[PDB]
Amino acid sequence: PAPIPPFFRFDTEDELPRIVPVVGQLPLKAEELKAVPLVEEIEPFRLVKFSGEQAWVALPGWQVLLAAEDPVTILATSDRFPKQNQTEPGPVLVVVDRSQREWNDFSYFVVDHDGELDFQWFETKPEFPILGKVIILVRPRRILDENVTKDSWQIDE
Amino acid sequence: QTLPKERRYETLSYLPPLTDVQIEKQVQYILSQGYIPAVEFNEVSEPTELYWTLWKLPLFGAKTSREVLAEVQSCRSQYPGHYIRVVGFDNIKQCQILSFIVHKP
């Protein structure tokens, strides 16, 4: 008997991720955020390509994230955003798209800071060039690696 | 408008009183399924009292014909004061397929 091929088909309940291009650790330059190109989809798998030197991180499919146009990622730490709990400052991935230039008081906005890059919320509309509203702020995993991602035969109990 | 205190009897009691054409058309369901029908008479229709006395036999002469229908009218002339039934019988499933009163005192 021939074995059944692993023909998995994407379901409409479960959302599929999108690769978000990253730029280096803070501090960076304002020209470095501008040199990042727009990323188009290569159907039917988001099969994206590039020719030069860029570092890309796929980040899972969320409601805000998949409904975004120019997602860019900037590596920074926890203190570059305000304090929220008792935990120490650690590493935080940011995601900010390039085409949500807007004034919001509750949302965060990356700007140009004299040819550098930062984070600051806005109570009044500035004369500064806002380079986009942040999408999502994520920090790494804290798991036990060899069974989370490397073994499928586990049960709940 | 309300519901009267009316004593009702069995599995076709909530109907008009069943005439003869209907019972001829009723037993023609019973014997057409291969079932043997019968006639059962009793003095009272009590919830405690759960047997009624069989009239002569579970009568049967052919695959489909008037068997029961003549025998009920002979029992109406014999017992004009007993609750007369017509019951079916299955032998595979082994229960009655009908139990309904054709005649009341």
Partner: protein, 434 residues
């Protein structure tokens, strides 16, 4: 692994087959997940003989029209499980295997208890036949109100709504899910003021009226002192929510009702946690077969009237599994394994949707004689009360019983016999419009 996937294994007539609906995680092939659902329901991943007690997947059969899903037929042997324990079927088969992480969803569709293993159980206390012989109610689907309002009624006001329904031709009357005992209505008083309302409605109209007294209780001691009291009120029937109270308390009350002559109405409360999603859980034809093996003379099989052709062929699939002696393998009708019940007694199939007068052609045609028709669940009662409301639900029965017994095709000539029975019944004519 792949020692648990034996695709040439013709299963024996004494195996306990099981047909899962495996939806594996991607990259897990179909044989290796089907060997895995045969793995962790046995002989998990030599000290013994493996080849005698292992579950063996023996066929895959991919579900038509939907990839990443198949029907892993697993063949568990007989001597793995306990004689008479339907809570050891589920502990073995659906115990440790749905939370298996190489699987996105796993659904126990069907299960074949062999003739060798059905005989260790008791079956129902009383079948279709012995239930009808105890109640003396032949050749019609039986009836039932459901006492609205559920909550708040004191035990005598509750029994007045029982006596009012049980006058007008209704056979049974259901006690609710969320009524076991509660500070407005204790069970000792609810059972007392219902026995005083059955023996008033049974003595009035000479049929053996009953009421599904709810003996679902916190402990199995409190359950049996709740059923032994309904025995000593000479009640014909009790009821029990068998998936909240479980299969150890059901099989306790199975054995009790057989040894005390009380009919058992099994209610499928908390069933929709596990049979309602089409990809994961335990399909109700497992849970229908699971309580035909433990107790119950009745089980709610829901309704038919709000469902498509394919969703009522599956519902008439497990109505036949719990009511007929031998049921052939028909997968369009939902049944995956041919099931000989070995002359085990049947279970009534209870119809309890949002149903009313105009559904008596449908539910006597679909559900046959061997059924019970509940009412009052969704439909808004009756304008004249309960006793004209129950006579509307009883004249419409025996019109559709008389019509079916005269060749009249109730699928097509069904709305005629409701309208020509509303003439000879004033209680049904006012129920004829809503």
């Amino acid at each position: 692994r792949l020692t648990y996937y034996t695709p040439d294994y013709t299963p024996k007539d004494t195996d306990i087959l099981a047909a899962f609906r495996v939806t594996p995680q991607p990259g897990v092939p179909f044989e290796e997940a089907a060997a895995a659902v045969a793995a962790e329901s046995s002989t998990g991943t030599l000290l013994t003989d493996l080849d005698r007690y292992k579950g063996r997947c023996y066929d895959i059969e991919p579900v038509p029209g939907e990839d990443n899903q198949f029907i892993a037929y697993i063949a568990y042997p007989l001597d793995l499980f306990e004689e008479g324990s339907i809570t050891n079927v589920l502990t073995s088969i659906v115990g440790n295997v749905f939370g298996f992480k190489a699987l996105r969803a796993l659904r126990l569709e069907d299960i074949r208890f062999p003739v060798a293993y059905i005989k260790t159980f008791q079956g129902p206390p009383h079948g279709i036949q012995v239930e009808r012989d105890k109640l003396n109610k032949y050749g019609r689907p039986l009836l039932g109100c459901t006492i609205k309002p559920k909550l708040g009624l004191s035990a005598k006001n509750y029994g007045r709504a029982v006596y009012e329904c049980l006058r007008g031709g209704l056979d049974f009357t259901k006690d609710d899910e969320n009524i076991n005992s509660a500070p407005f209505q204790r069970w000792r008083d609810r059972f007392l003021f219902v026995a005083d309302a059955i023996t008033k409605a049974q003595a009035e109209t000479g049929e053996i009226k009953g009421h599904y007294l709810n003996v679902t209780a916190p402990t199995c001691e409190e359950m049996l002192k709740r059923a032994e009291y309904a025995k000593e009120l000479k009640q014909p029937i009790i009821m029990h929510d068998y998936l909240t109270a479980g299969f150890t308390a059901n099989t306790t009350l199975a054995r009790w009702c057989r040894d005390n002559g009380v009919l058992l109405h099994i209610h499928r409360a908390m069933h929709a946690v596990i049979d309602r999603q089409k990809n994961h859980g335990i399909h109700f034809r497992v849970l229908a077969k699971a309580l035909r093996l433990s107790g119950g003379d009745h089980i709610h099989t829901g309704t038919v009237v709000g469902k498509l052709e394919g969703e009522r062929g599956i519902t008439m699939g497990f109505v036949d599994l719990l009511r007929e002696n031998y049921v052939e393998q028909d997968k369009s009708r939902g049944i995956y394994f041919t099931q000989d019940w070995a002359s085990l007694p049947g279970v009534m199939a209870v119809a309890s949707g949002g149903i009313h007068v105009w559904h008596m052609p449908a539910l006597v045609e679909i559900f046959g004689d061997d059924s019970v028709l509940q009412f009052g669940g969704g439909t808004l009662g009756h304008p004249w009360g309960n006793a004209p409301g129950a006579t509307a639900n009883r004249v419409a029965l025996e019109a559709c019983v008389q019509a079916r017994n005269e060749g009249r095709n109730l699928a097509r000539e069904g709305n005629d016999v409701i309208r020509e029975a509303a003439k000879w019944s004033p209680e049904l004519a006012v129920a004829c419009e809503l």
